[PDB]
Design a protein around this ligand. Structure first.
Ligand code: MTQ
Ligand code: MTQ
Ligand SMILES: [Cs+]
Ligand SMILES: [Cs+]
Ligand SMILES: [Cs+]
Ligand SMILES: [Cs+]
Lengths: 388, 388
């Protein structure tokens, strides 16, 4: 034991004051819209924070370890020294919380849960060890779907403490396939944006699962548990699922839906507020677009006339570099930043929507995708510009 | 030379007479709706047929070969005997033509091209050698993105002859990443539904690229050409791209869009016609749903009231087996068949839409996704039931 998960909030780390706080305990927060999109790589200070419990505190860093157990030949135990000695990779990858844009779905028909605007999302450079390498180390070769021992899934278990698990830890799981395929870039990350991982973001070690919803990138690892069936954790089985609009608290059956992993094409306008005063002339419409599953953004469309007509915005990743969608130069796990300059002379509704590399679209209206958990609001984002 | 590509249509193979023919020369055809969905595995007789030119004819089977050239150490030449001696795989995979459902898009605003109804799609068991294995044979190891010789793409060149290429061959390409990853199941297929591959479908050898539009699964292979940049073939650069609705023949710039590979969530009702007479009582609404990229179908929704309310249809792959979406038992490259029994007492509009494992949705209206080439019509399919 080099680390503990507190059961109360007295030793929480400090955060940037500019953060819009959606829940204090546990800590759930997001940057102001106008700062989200200022840079392609999200500074740690401004990277959104989503926690189900108190933040773990490390008393003694050497003596911290991740335990490799379950359907494995030799249940080893891996120290932070051991993880840093594996071949290091740097993966650029956006974490988007499945809760992103929930508040606007709630406004239409109420949802229980923490409120989020348009910034429950962040892009960072993750440094660490590939999970496939770590599993090779324990007798599970690369590109394996299942083993002779019955292994099919990999469960990541935290050291934190959540009310929902009655004081137990946050957990998630992924398939052995995904875990064991180095091209899927699942990372045991000990670094974020070139610095040592912070407390808020999972120090000393988190999993990062690219192209998958935020909720699966488990922070503050206690164990990596190789198992026969998917994790039966509360947050795999009784959350983070996409129900149809007909489903409510009286008819919900949690086993009727599969756990959400991949996520669909998303965009939002960030350079202006949902209802914003402007001076006549040129206004810069800037924002983000992403899709899960390693799919890029082929197109961002912007409309000034209630969606009769669209004009195409520009798209960019690393600044200077030209963005190309299904391409070896592109950062396939990361968002894409969009900009369009428009001419305003009158009170104007502006709308943004994105289309990904697989030609997937965003739903026109929240109503068609409205869901009980208030997740994956990918409605066309509509903003209103007014003449002040 | 054991095979040739004709320049004229005098030696075309026979087809099933039930086929609805959309163009005779070259041969472009699709089964009647009502037969499409009778079985999970589409019989070869009824599997849709899409050709840009005359069908190649083989005069001498031994002496046919595929040539491995380009950015490769030892330009080998591989005979059909050699391909069959590699480890055989059987992959279940749906080919959907990017042109599927084009005619309905054209009704709204005219598109140039061959007309298709709802059946430019088919599901089969493909037998052959993995392309990753074949490339390993020529010194390119598995899970490579690029090589020291500058290789980044793999181009498949046919032996056929197309007007568009001025008598030259149909070609496509994929990334070295996709080609070389055995989990992507790219196959050099010599078998289809347990029999030897037909002429129509590429005898003796075609590529099948799962989870990617039909157009990339190049038939009647002449050469597998490892190269530094994407193929400059006509059908990669000047076709099979997804343009926004504002693009027309006066403003089109082909380099403005990337070549379409993955495709989005699609469904159609097949057990009844777009306008159909029924007797009061119980009517079975049966169809297909698919998505590209190895994504499953999480949900199919059916509405009888103009899309105010939806009820969930059932979903099935292999009969008897229970379909589960992101699961080891599921056929991730294959379509999903849906059925719902409904009660009709009155004249009724029925609507079907699907939602994939990544929670991607279908666009409500063609207008929003209308495009010049008339590809990837994934509009909600609406049918009209009348009281006769
Ligand atoms: N140990 C641990 N405890 C958590 O509550 C926990 N929650 C997260 C969810 S649920 Mo969601 O609501 O799909 S977004 C999200 C991210 C947030 O990463 P970060 O704080 O570092 O921005 O951490 C995931 N990882 C976790 N790990
Ligand atoms: N050699 C060759 N010539 C073709 O014209 C050719 N066209 C195809 C397209 S273009 Mo599309 O417009 O996206 S659907 C489709 C499929 C059809 O395979 P099959 O006919 O056996 O169903 O083969 C692709 N492979 C090809 N291979
Ligand atoms: Cs431990
Ligand atoms: Cs890159
Ligand atoms: Cs050849
Ligand atoms: Cs399977």
């Amino acid at each position: 034991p080099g680390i503990r998960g507190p059961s109360e909030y007295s030793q929480e780390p400090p955060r940037h004051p500019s953060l819009k706080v959606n829940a204090k305990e546990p800590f759930n927060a997001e940057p102001p819209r106008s700062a989200l999109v200022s840079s392609y790589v999200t500074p740690v200070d401004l990277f959104y924070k989503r926690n189900h419990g108190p933040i773990p505190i490390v008393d003694h860093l050497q003596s911290y370890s991740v335990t490799l157990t379950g359907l494995i030949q030799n249940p080893r135990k891996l120290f932070i020294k051991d993880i840093r000695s594996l071949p290091k990779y740097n993966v650029t990858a956006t974490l988007q919380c499945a809760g992103n844009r929930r508040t606007a779905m709630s406004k239409v028909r109420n949802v229980r849960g923490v409120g989020w605007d348009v910034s429950a999302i962040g892009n960072a450079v993750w440094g660490g060890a590939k999970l496939a390498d770590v599993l090779e180390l324990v007798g599970i070769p690369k590109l394996t779907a299942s083993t002779n021992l019955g292994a099919r899934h990999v469960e990541f278990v935290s050291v934190d403490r959540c009310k929902e698990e009655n004081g137990g830890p946050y957990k998630a799981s992924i398939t052995l396939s995904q875990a064991t395929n180095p091209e899927a870039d699942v990372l045991l990350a000990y670094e974020m944006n070139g610095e040592t991982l912070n407390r808020d973001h999972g120090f000393p070690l988190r999993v990062v699962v690219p192209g998958v919803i935020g909720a699966r990138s488990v922070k503050w690892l206690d164990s990596i548990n190789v198992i026969a069936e998917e994790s039966q954790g509360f947050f795999m089985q009784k959350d983070y699922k996409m129900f149809p609009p007909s489903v409510n608290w009286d008819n919900i059956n949690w086993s009727s839906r599969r756990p959400q992993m991949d996520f669909p094409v998303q965009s939002a306008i960030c350079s202006v507020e949902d209802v914003q005063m402007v001076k006549p002339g040129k206004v810069s419409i800037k924002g983000y677009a992403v899709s899960g599953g390693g799919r890029g953004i082929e197109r961002v469309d912007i409309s000034l006339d209630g969606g009769k007509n669209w004009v195409e915005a520009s798209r960019t990743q690393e600044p200077g570099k030209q963005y190309i969608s299904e391409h070896s130069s592109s950062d396939k796990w990361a968002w894409v930043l969009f900009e369009a300059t428009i001419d305003v002379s009158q009170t104007t509704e502006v709308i943004a929507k994105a289309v990904d590399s697989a030609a997937n679209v965003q739903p026109e209206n929240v109503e068609s995708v409205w869901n009980l958990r208030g997740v994956l609001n990918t409605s066309w984002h509509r903003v209103l510009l007014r003449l002040g």
